[PDB]
């Protein structure tokens, strides 16, 4: 009966590893999400200094 519990343990091991692969994909995507969150935020801070320099 080892050929059934070994296959079920292998399928449960791959299904357990798939959540770690998805967590690694989300952790890989969060670093690009932070850089997009800063690159989308600097452009609103540049135009305030440019409009303040033009008004000054």
């Amino acid at each position: 009966s080892q050929k059934n519990g070994i296959a079920t343990l292998l399928q449960a091991e791959k299904e357990a590893h798939e959540i770690v692969s998805k967590a690694r994909k989300y952790r890989q995507d969060k670093l690009k999400q932070a850089k997009t969150d800063a690159a989308k935020e600097i452009d609103s801070y540049k135009i305030q200094k440019d409009k303040e320099l033009k008004e000054f």
Binding site: S1, Q2, K3, G5, I6, A7, L9, L10, E13, K14, A16, H17
Partner: protein, 56 residues
């Protein structure tokens, strides 16, 4: 004699699973007289074991 020899001619994908870090493969050489003691004490030999693996 099983002291320096390693199984490399009778290995299959249903007796040794090393595709994940959760499960591993450990070989235990026992005598002919100590087969029932290793089969009965195989569950109590270590925690987190796989049952139904007592086979020649």
């Amino acid at each position: 004699d099983l002291s320096v020899r390693s199984l490399h001619d009778i290995v299959k994908p249903e007796d040794f699973v090393l595709n994940s870090e959760h499960l591993t493969t450990v070989l235990v050489a026992v005598p002919k007289s100590l087969k029932s003691d290793f089969e009965k004490s195989y569950e109590t030999l270590s925690k987190n074991v796989v049952p139904a693996s007592a086979s020649v």
